[PDB]
């Protein structure tokens, strides 16, 4: 089984693996904050992100796909599964400061993952990627 990804309207990216489906969005809103949220410095720490193994596996699959190095790259955040706001994880994709090299490798990884990828992140501005559960669209490949 291989996760399949479909893009609709060239602005939103949807990935479905198994029974788990996510929607990837880019904006400057910092939904997750490092002070109060789980830090993913090791792939085994993602068990705190969800109660469903499908969401954990699909999350781990995506970071492996974009070339995320769990021990060299900046750690990303995810919401503690004990909270009720819902599943989400957030990667800093801002092309600025010391995060420049990682942000540039993330753009390369997305461009190889999705054939049509609109890079919303602009140089010098904060850009935060967030993947949250969503109902799988019936208007995109199955």
């Amino acid at each position, epitope marked *: 089984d291989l996760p399949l990804l479909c893009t609709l309207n060239k602005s939103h990216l949807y990935i479905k693996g198994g029974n788990a489906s996510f929607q990837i969005s880019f904006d400057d809103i*910092a939904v997750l904050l490092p002070q109060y949220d789980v830090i993913i410095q090791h792939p085994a720490d993602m068990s705190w992100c969800s109660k469903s193994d499908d969401q954990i596996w699909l999350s781990q699959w995506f970071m492996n796909a974009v070339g995320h190095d769990w021990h060299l790259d900046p750690p990303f955040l995810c919401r503690n599964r004990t909270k009720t706001e819902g599943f989400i994880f957030q990667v800093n994709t801002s092309k600025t400061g010391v995060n420049e090299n990682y942000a540039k490798k993330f753009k390369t990884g997305m461009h190889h993952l999705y054939r049509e990828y609109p890079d919303s992140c602009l140089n010098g501005k904060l850009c935060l990627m967030k993947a949250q559960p969503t109902s799988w669209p019936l208007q995109c490949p199955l």
Partner: antibody
């Protein structure tokens, strides 16, 4: 029209210390099952304080409570009745406040606990 | 261990058509996860903005908010008589959700 009505199932707002009171909040004008529900009490002359939250049917009806309230209150919901309830046991005199039910939706595409709409509130006083 | 939201001015006197800013101070950094509400005579609160600066659909154009980190301000331009109410902030970045002390908006005479 996204109307939230609060009522008391048993008796009135006044209750004696150590007794149990159940608060019922009925919603209308929107799909109750889609959004999460919160309970909030406001003490007289004090700031508003969060009490509890219950999530939708997609999640296994999970809930979260505050520390002072853990082990004494229980939040519940009925999608068919489209109403959220708050069962309060071993009530202490500190619990005297006006209780509110509120709805939280999706804000700029992300789940957050900002309160969309509120109930009118029921005054709850506990004394001897 | 719980973030507290303190408002320096418990009461603010203003006139119709004036500009008024209400400041919210957080004990810890809450980033952008801040909302503002309005409450009249102890009735049900009404959401004004969310995510620090995103105005709610029902809210009129007069209300504008902003801020990041631990400092958040809510400004009202061309204040009307119906704007005289209570205003308080809220953070939803961490449990438990905590609200501000509150500011009352009063008319000069």
């Amino acid at each position: 029209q996204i109307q939230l009505v609060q009522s008391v199932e048993t008796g009135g707002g006044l209750v004696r210390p150590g007794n149990s009171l159940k608060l019922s909040c009925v919603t209308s004008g929107f799909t109750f099952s889609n959004y999460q529900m919160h309970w909030l009490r406001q003490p007289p002359g004090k700031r508003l304080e969060w009490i509890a939250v219950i999530t939708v049917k997609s999640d296994n009806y999970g809930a979260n409570y505050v520390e002072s309230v853990k082990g004494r209150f229980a939040i519940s919901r009925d999608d068919s009745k489209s109403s959220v309830y708050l069962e309060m046991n071993r009530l202490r005199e500190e619990d005297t406040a006006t209780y509110f039910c509120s709805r939280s939706g999706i804000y700029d595409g992300y789940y957050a606990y900002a309160m969309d709409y509120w109930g009118q509130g029921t005054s709850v006083t506990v004394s001897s | 261990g719980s973030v507290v939201m303190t408002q320096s001015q418990k009461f603010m006197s203003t006139s119709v058509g004036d500009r008024v800013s209400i400041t919210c101070k957080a004990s810890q950094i809450v980033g952008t996860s801040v909302a503002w509400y309005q409450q009249k005579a102890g009735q049900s609160p009404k959401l004004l903005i969310y995510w620090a600066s995103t105005r709610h659909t029902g809210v009129p154009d007069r209300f504008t908010a902003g801020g990041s980190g631990t400092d958040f301000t809510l400004t009202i331009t061309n204040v009307q008589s119906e704007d005289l109410a209570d205003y308080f902030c809220q953070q939803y970045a961490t449990y438990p959700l905590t609200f501000g002390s509150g500011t009352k908006l009063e008319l000069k005479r």
